[PDB]
Amino acid sequence: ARPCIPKSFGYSSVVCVCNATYCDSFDPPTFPALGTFSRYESTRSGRRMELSMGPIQANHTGTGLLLTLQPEQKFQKVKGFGGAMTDAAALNILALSPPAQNLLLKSYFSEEGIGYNIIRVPMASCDFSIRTYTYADTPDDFQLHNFSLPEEDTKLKIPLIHRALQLAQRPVSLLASPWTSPTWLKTNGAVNGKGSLKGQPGDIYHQTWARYFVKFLDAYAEHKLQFWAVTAENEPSAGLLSGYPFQCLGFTPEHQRDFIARDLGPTLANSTHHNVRLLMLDDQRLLLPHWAKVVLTDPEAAKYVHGIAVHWYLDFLAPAKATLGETHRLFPNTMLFASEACVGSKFWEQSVRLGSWDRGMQYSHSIITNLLYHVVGWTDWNLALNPEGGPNWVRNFVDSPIIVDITKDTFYKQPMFYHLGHFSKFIPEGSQRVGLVASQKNDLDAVALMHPDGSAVVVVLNRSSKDVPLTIKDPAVGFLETISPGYSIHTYLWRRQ
Ligand SMILES: *[C@@H]1O[C@H](CO)[C@@H](O[C@@H]2O[C@H](CO)[C@@H](O[C@@H]3O[C@H](CO[C@H]4O[C@H](CO)[C@@H](O)[C@H](O)[C@@H]4O)[C@@H](O)[C@H](O)[C@@H]3O)[C@H](O)[C@H]2NC(C)=O)[C@H](O)[C@H]1NC(C)=O
Numbered sequence: 449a450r451p452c453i454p455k456s457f458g459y460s461s462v463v464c465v466c467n468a469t470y471c472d473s474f475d476p477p478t479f480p481a482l483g484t485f486s487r488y489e490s491t492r493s494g495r496r497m498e499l500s501m502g503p504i505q506a507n508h509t510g511t512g513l514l515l516t517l518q519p520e521q522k523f524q525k526v527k528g529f530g531g532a533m534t535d536a537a538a539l540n541i542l543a544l545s546p547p548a549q550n551l552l553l554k555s556y557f558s559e560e561g562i563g564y565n566i567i568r569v570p571m572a573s574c575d576f577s578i579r580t581y582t583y584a585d586t587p588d589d590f591q592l593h594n595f596s597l598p599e600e601d602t603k604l605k606i607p608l609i610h611r612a613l614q615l616a617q618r619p620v621s622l623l624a625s626p627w628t629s630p631t632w633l634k635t636n637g638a639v640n641g642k643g644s645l646k647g648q649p650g651d652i653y654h655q656t657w658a659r660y661f662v663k664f665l666d667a668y669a670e671h672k673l674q675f676w677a678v679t680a681e682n683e684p685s686a687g688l689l690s691g692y693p694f695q696c697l698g699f700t701p702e703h704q705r706d707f708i709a710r711d712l713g714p715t716l717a718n719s720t721h722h723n724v725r726l727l728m729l730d731d732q733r734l735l736l737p738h739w740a741k742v743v744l745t746d747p748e749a750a751k752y753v754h755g756i757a758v759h760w761y762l763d764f765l766a767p768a769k770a771t772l773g774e775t776h777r778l779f780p781n782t783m784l785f786a787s788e789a790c791v792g793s794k795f796w797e798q799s800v801r802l803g804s805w806d807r808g809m810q811y812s813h814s815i816i817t818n819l820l821y822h823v824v825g826w827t828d829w830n831l832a833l834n835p836e837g838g839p840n841w842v843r844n845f846v847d848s849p850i851i852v853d854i855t856k857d858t859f860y861k862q863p864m865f866y867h868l869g870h871f872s873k874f875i876p877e878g879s880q881r882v883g884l885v886a887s888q889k890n891d892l893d894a895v896a897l898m899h900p901d902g903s904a905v906v907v908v909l910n911r912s913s914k915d916v917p918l919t920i921k922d923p924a925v926g927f928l929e930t931i932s933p934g935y936s937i938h939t940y941l942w943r944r945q
Pocket residue numbers: 453466467468469470
């Protein structure tokens with residue numbers, strides 16, 4: 449293993465500095481012996497997923513905080529964790545020297561790094577692009593004879609996705625989402641602004657747009673890439689808004705319902721891509737449960753919908769119980785999945801705050817809350833950005849867990865990288881959330897899961913300044929005596945047999 453090289457930029461914590469010859473990494477992962485636990489600790493004071501071990505003891509006395517594992521009490525199974533391969537992320541990554549590129553990709557995708565198993569792939573251009581394009585810009589090509597992948601896919605995204613899959617030990621799931629259709633399919637004839645597909649579901653415009661998904665998956669399959677899932681549209685609500693500044697395509701929930709039922713569902717179902725999952729919504733969770741009721745109460749739409757994708761941007765309006773909780777109660781067999789998050793998109797937020805602990809805590813707080821309300825996965829936005837938070841053709845700059853400094857052939861791993869890795873690295877696909885009961889009221893955020901192999905994982909986040917001693921009881925194994933430092937995040941792992 450190789451430790452964090454810390455650097456301060458005057459914010460609350462440090463970044464870890466990597467370059468062509470050096471990056472912080474782990475040793476090969478294992479469980480310690482039965483009766484021992486592993487702790488990984490990150491702190492605002494500068495610890496970065498530091499590994500320690502302790503004994504699991506037969507007995508416990510005290511009136512301190514006890515968190516009792518409920519291994520019998522089972523909730524959702526995890527799909528996974530990852531980020532987005534936008535044009536901006538791909539340009540930032542490929543601007544590094546080849547050896548620095550490989551250290552960045554290992555940081556995300558390998559067991560020497562944090563074990564990402566999800567990549568979100570935009571279907572052509574979005575705001576995190578430098579060129580505005582679709583795959584079918586030749587007008588009135590309803591046949592899609594002129595559908596093609598440009599160099600943004602064939603030279604940048606696709607080769608990087610192959611290199612990520614080559615570095616991974618866990619199967620990586622690709623997720624595709626479109627921002628805009630070709631402008632000749634749209635009411636407003638522009639990639640942006642208020643506008644929907646022309647006509648109505650079941651017509652030539654909607655059939656063409658559904659066939660465009662199949663053409664996309666056909667083109668990526670020619671490059672030996674297969675998708676786990678697509679979303680029905682990135683942020684369909686955005687295309688309902690006057691002047692929306694970048695690539696969008698407006699659907700009401702009724703329009704999405706009818707488009708899925710008539711066009712996208714049947715077109716995917718009758719293609720070689722029939723196993724590819726379809727996720728609906730791909731938008732702010734305040735739209736639940738209303739969007740889920742509109743789409744999923746129509747059985748002809750419901751039969752094609754695997755899952756509901758959510759974005760975090762208005763989570764402050766949208767209590768998890770009233771949205772995620774209510775949606776799970778009404779549609780328990782339709783998985784909830786978090787498909788886009790980043791800090792820096794509010795007009796008052798600075799784009800990039802190198803070393804921000806607050807932004808790290810925003811990530812881990814969101815992931816825990818999502819996991820506590822049945823969500824099966826969590827997906828970052830841009831995998832890498834430049835120090836301005838770009839490039840972005842409408843200057844909608846944001847933050848990213850990795851910031852590339854091409855003049856120094858350097859990249860910085862921010863607190864958000866480690867906060868996400870406290871989950872991604874230690875919660876493999878198939879992990880099942882289990883109960884975790886507190887003996888008393890407390891300021892911690894915590895979640896417990898069981899690996900498919902039966903081992904235990906617990907993540908504890910302390911967003912307070914105060915150290916909290918605590919005990920974790922696993923009824924079948926014993927007690928972990930520990931302490932959650934102020935402004936810390938821990939992951940605990942142990943064999944149960
Ligand atoms: C890529 O990043 C690498 C990590 O920063 C760069 O390597 C570093 O280069 C600097 C400047 O030559 C070295 O700094 C000197 O450090 C020694 C202390 O050395 C040792 O102790 C440190 C821990 O404090 C440990 O990390 C090392 O392994 C050594 O045992 C001081 O005495 C000097 O005054 C001066 O500060 C770093 O030691 C060196 N680190 C490593 C791990 O090699 C590398 O140059 C960068 N590459 C490019 C192409 O830019």
